[PDB]
Scaffold this motif. Structure first.
Motif, PDB file in Angstrom:
ATOM      1  N   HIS A 114     101.440  81.114  43.413  1.00 40.75           N
ATOM      2  CA  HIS A 114     100.436  81.920  44.106  1.00 40.75           C
ATOM      3  C   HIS A 114      99.156  81.952  43.283  1.00 40.75           C
ATOM      4  CE1 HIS A 114     103.107  83.129  47.342  1.00 40.75           C
ATOM      5  NE2 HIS A 114     104.040  83.307  46.422  1.00 40.75           N
ATOM      6  N   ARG A 115      98.512  80.783  43.290  1.00 37.51           N
ATOM      7  CA  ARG A 115      97.328  80.473  42.494  1.00 37.51           C
ATOM      8  C   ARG A 115      96.306  81.599  42.518  1.00 37.51           C
ATOM      9  NH1 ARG A 115     100.679  77.455  45.451  1.00 37.51           N
ATOM     10  NH2 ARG A 115      99.056  77.040  47.010  1.00 37.51           N
ATOM     11  N   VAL A 116      96.063  82.162  43.699  1.00 39.56           N
ATOM     12  CA  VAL A 116      95.215  83.337  43.866  1.00 39.56           C
ATOM     13  C   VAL A 116      96.117  84.553  44.023  1.00 39.56           C
ATOM     14  CG1 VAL A 116      93.324  84.353  45.178  1.00 39.56           C
ATOM     15  CG2 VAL A 116      93.493  81.868  44.959  1.00 39.56           C
TER      16      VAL A 116
ATOM     17  N   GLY B 110      92.522  84.036  39.879  1.00 41.72           N
ATOM     18  CA  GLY B 110      93.062  82.775  40.350  1.00 41.72           C
ATOM     19  C   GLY B 110      91.977  81.757  40.625  1.00 41.72           C
ATOM     20  N   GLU B 111      92.358  80.753  41.415  1.00 42.91           N
ATOM     21  CA  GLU B 111      91.456  79.689  41.848  1.00 42.91           C
ATOM     22  C   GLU B 111      90.623  80.233  43.002  1.00 42.91           C
ATOM     23  OE1 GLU B 111      91.502  76.466  40.054  1.00 42.91           O
ATOM     24  OE2 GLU B 111      92.410  78.081  38.878  1.00 42.91           O
ATOM     25  N   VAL B 112      89.580  80.976  42.643  1.00 46.56           N
ATOM     26  CA  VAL B 112      88.744  81.694  43.598  1.00 46.56           C
ATOM     27  C   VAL B 112      87.394  80.999  43.700  1.00 46.56           C
ATOM     28  CG1 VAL B 112      87.492  83.843  43.993  1.00 46.56           C
ATOM     29  CG2 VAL B 112      89.913  83.886  43.343  1.00 46.56           C
ATOM     30  N   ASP B 113      87.015  80.622  44.920  1.00 51.28           N
ATOM     31  CA  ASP B 113      85.695  80.052  45.135  1.00 51.28           C
ATOM     32  C   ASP B 113      84.639  81.150  45.001  1.00 51.28           C
ATOM     33  OD1 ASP B 113      86.663  77.462  45.622  1.00 51.28           O
ATOM     34  OD2 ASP B 113      86.889  77.843  47.771  1.00 51.28           O
ATOM     35  N   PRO B 114      83.488  80.873  44.355  1.00 51.08           N
ATOM     36  CA  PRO B 114      82.519  81.954  44.124  1.00 51.08           C
ATOM     37  C   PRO B 114      81.723  82.333  45.362  1.00 51.08           C
ATOM     38  CG  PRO B 114      81.644  79.916  43.266  1.00 51.08           C
ATOM     39  CD  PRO B 114      83.006  79.590  43.805  1.00 51.08           C
ATOM     40  N   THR B 115      81.302  81.337  46.147  1.00 49.65           N
ATOM     41  CA  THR B 115      80.426  81.615  47.283  1.00 49.65           C
ATOM     42  C   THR B 115      81.137  82.425  48.358  1.00 49.65           C
ATOM     43  OG1 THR B 115      78.929  80.604  48.899  1.00 49.65           O
ATOM     44  CG2 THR B 115      81.002  79.432  48.456  1.00 49.65           C
ATOM     45  N   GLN B 116      82.460  82.295  48.459  1.00 46.30           N
ATOM     46  CA  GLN B 116      83.200  82.999  49.493  1.00 46.30           C
ATOM     47  C   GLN B 116      83.501  84.451  49.157  1.00 46.30           C
ATOM     48  OE1 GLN B 116      86.664  80.456  49.945  1.00 46.30           O
ATOM     49  NE2 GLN B 116      85.257  78.710  50.042  1.00 46.30           N
TER      50      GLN B 116
END
Lengths: 420, 151, 99, 81
Positions: free
Chosen positions: A344-346, A299-305
């Motif tokens: 549910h994008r992620v 999904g729309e996952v931030d990389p740094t987190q």
């Protein structure tokens, strides 16, 4: 190398049918198999390439006493799945015996696809445990493939039947299947009918038509479990590379499933992990522990987190496990596909090795032991008796499965360094 | 090669255990290097070169991006102190898979305890080397992997 | 025609400011040329694509192409001691070009 | 391969000794041991020698040249000898 899926039995053919239909909709494929006009993905592995963009999957559909395979044929997707590779009892012995006589022609069907492919890594079986016709034949075919392809690997998406316990010979059938699977299968992903039915009651009011709706849940698990292969990535660009993480010791090769938005019809990676580790999202029914866990998020996952999320999960300490293997958890990522709804994008999934499944195996072993003492259902049909007069492969399976149970509990013990 | 070699791989059961005590470590190193460092850094490079408007600054930003991947991957500065530890514990995996082949029992290997002790103590050295980074060095890059879960 | 652009704007204690109307010509020329470099290297001799290639399906990111390439070289069957046959290596790369 | 002198200057004599053998067999339908046997045994040994020599040479590494080997390697016939 391209994967061939050996869907067999009525139930196995139903779930393979739905899985290939799901990957048709997900990929740029129509019910006629032509490339979609509206349409970045690795379609090589699962879909054979025709010259005219006819993306035919490498499906081997095996029918025995066909009823639902005719329904499969009279479908819009019949042209989609056309390798032209379909070749014509409720007992394990009957299925095994029926398979033996046609073993050469179905194996020639196997050979042709293995040959038409540039190369072959794996045989993925949509196998049904205690599936009447499906079981027995699947065990025999499983025994044949490893011998003919020693280097190659076999995975089994076994739909282990728990329906609250009609077939009276279920424990016997499942017992023999598990023996063949324990010694002759490289990997198994276990699913549960009661568990998926309980989830069905949870998410929806569906109770009576459980099988038809549960097919969709199974299909979601099967597609998501392969998405990282179907779509290129930084890691796990091969089935075996993924499988290594999940199966730590050869005997203990049965895998737990989970899915964060069971109601997939924005959420941070921290949130989806701590949701996923909860038992409601799990889809399966003395200390007990995981051996190793893996999670894939699409999904729309931030990389740094993501690394901070893994840290947070380590503090948050839901998954309790002190196994002999150090493997705890690693956060992996795959790409959510276009053209389908991004609701549910992620959305995430987990494959794990858990000692709890020993309980479920021991339940069917318990049913079998009680049935064996009562001797109520030997079947003793002339087929059953002639094929097995001694009735000692049941005892061989009982000792093999008992070894498996003891190995699970020894894995729980601190000293699996010693023989298990 | 290391992860794939231990993949191509699979007393007789104790070898199966040592396989696992090894795959976790190598796969975790692979996870950090492959995604945490190179992918994340490559994303701001891809984004920022869009904004960049100069022939000289486009060189400068590219050189910064290469000097940061080449450093965040343990390939500059101290080498004997850090790199050789990972190299030697990789070499133990390489021997462990080179001295085994699929499908028999009589390996006749009595060095399994020697390799157990070797991997254990070199792992102790590796984690202590990473923990030494707390006093000095690249703490963001190292203290992320120093939480290797130890045991 | 930079001199024949300085002189027109000249023809309409303000000496430094007189020079200050001659630098925007350099600024415009560089503004068209900074364009010229980056656009030329992105539309004609594609730089974003050459670099994204240098990353993906090449040294930085394996993808699936590099998996297909790597497994063949790992394979122990019919493997020379160091398997440094350049024709074989190049052939494997062209089989795994995949683009 | 006409550019390189050795392979050309050996395949040519492979063909020429075969010309001579074709002449010898063409002479008569009746069996001929009238020194034909002597030069024929010499011929089979010599042709095996040069054929195996060029086999060793075959085994820029162009695909056509290297692939041509396995036609004969099917039997492993000259290598096994």
């Amino acid at each position: 190398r391209e994967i061939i899926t050996l869907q067999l039995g009525q139930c196995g053919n139903q779930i393979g049918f739905e899985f290939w239909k799901q990957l048709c909709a997900e990929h740029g494929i129509s019910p006629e198999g032509i490339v979609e006009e509206f349409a970045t993905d690795r379609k090589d592995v699962f879909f054979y390439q025709a010259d005219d963009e006819h993306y035919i999957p490498r499906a081997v559909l095996l029918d025995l006493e066909p009823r639902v395979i005719h329904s499969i044929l009279n479908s819009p997707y019949a042209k989609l799945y056309n390798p032209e590779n379909i070749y014509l009892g409720n007992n394990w012995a009957s299925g095994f015996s029926q398979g033996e006589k046609i073993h050469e022609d179905i194996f020639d069907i196997i050979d042709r696809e293995a040959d038409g492919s540039d190369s072959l890594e794996g045989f993925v079986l949509c196998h049904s445990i205690a599936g009447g016709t499906g079981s027995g034949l699947g065990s025999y075919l499983l025994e044949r493939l490893n011998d003919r392809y020693p280097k190659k690997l076999v995975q089994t998406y076994s739909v282990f039947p728990n329906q609250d316990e009609d077939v009276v010979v279920q424990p016997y059938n499942s017992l023999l299947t598990l023996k063949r699977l324990t010694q002759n299968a490289d990997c198994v992903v276990v699913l549960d009918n009661t568990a998926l039915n309980r989830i069905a009651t949870d998410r929806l009011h569906i109770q009576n038509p459980s099988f038809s709706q549960i097919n969709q849940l199974v299909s979601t698990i099967m597609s998501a479990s392969t998405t990282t292969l179907r779509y290129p990535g930084y890691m796990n660009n091969d089935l075996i590379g993924l499988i290594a993480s999940l199966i730590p010791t050869p005997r203990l090769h049965f895998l737990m499933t989970g899915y964060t938005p069971l109601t997939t019809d924005k959420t941070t990676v921290l949130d989806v992990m701590r949701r996923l580790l909860q038992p409601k999202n799990v889809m399966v029914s003395t200390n007990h522990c995981y051996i190793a866990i893996l999670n894939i998020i699409q999904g729309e996952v931030d990389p740094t987190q993501v690394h901070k999320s893994l840290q947070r999960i380590r503090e948050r300490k839901l998954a309790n496990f002190i196994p002999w293997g150090p493997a705890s958890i690693q956060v992996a990522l795959s790409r959510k596909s276009p053209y389908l709804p991004s609701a549910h994008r992620v959305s995430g999934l987990m494959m794990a090795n858990h000692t709890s499944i020993s309980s479920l195996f021991e339940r069917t072993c318990r049913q079998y032991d009680k049935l064996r003492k009562r001797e109520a259902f030997l079947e003793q049909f002339r087929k059953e008796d002639m094929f097995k007069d001694n009735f000692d492969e049941m005892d061989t399976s009982r000792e093999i499965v008992q070894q498996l149970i003891d190995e699970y509990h020894a894995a729980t013990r601190p000293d699996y360094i010693s023989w298990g | 090669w290391a992860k794939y070699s231990l993949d191509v791989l699979l007393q007789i059961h104790r070898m199966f255990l040592l396989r696992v005590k090894l795959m976790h470590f190598v796969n975790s190193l692979h996870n950090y290097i492959m995604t945490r460092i190179l992918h994340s850094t490559g994303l701001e490079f891809q984004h920022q070169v869009e904004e960049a408007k100069d022939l000289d600054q486009l060189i400068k930003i590219h050189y910064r991006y290469l000097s940061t991947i080449h450093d965040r991957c343990l390939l500059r500065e101290k080498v004997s102190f850090v790199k050789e530890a990972i190299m030697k514990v990789l070499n133990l995996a390489l021997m462990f898979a080179d001295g085994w082949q699929a499908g028999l029992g009589t390996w006749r290997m009595e060095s399994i305890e020697k390799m157990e002790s070797d991997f254990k103590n070199c792992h102790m050295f590796l984690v202590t080397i990473l923990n030494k980074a707390v006093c000095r060095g690249s703490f963001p890059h190292l203290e992320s992997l120093a939480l290797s879960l130890m045991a | 025609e930079l001199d024949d652009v300085h002189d027109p704007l000249l023809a309409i204690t303000f000496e430094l400011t007189l020079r200050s109307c001659l630098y925007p010509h350099i600024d415009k020329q560089y503004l068209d040329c900074c364009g010229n470099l980056m656009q030329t290297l992105k539309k004609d001799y594609r730089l974003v694509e050459y670099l994204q290639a240098m990353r993906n399906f090449f040294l930085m990111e394996g993808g699936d192409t590099m998996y297909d390439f790597y497994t063949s070289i790992f394979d122990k069957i019919r493997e020379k001691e160091t398997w440094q046959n350049v024709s074989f290596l190049n052939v494997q790369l062209q089989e795994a070009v995949g683009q | 391969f006409i550019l390189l002198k050795p392979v050309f200057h050996c395949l040519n004599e492979i063909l020429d000794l075969c010309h001579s053998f074709c002449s010898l067999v063409s002479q008569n339908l009746g069996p001929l041991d009238e020194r034909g046997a002597a030069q024929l045994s010499i011929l089979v040994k010599g042709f095996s020698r040069q054929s195996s020599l060029l086999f060793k040479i075959l085994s820029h590494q162009i695909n056509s040249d290297l692939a041509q080997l396995l036609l004969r390697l099917d039997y492993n016939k000259y290598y096994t000898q």
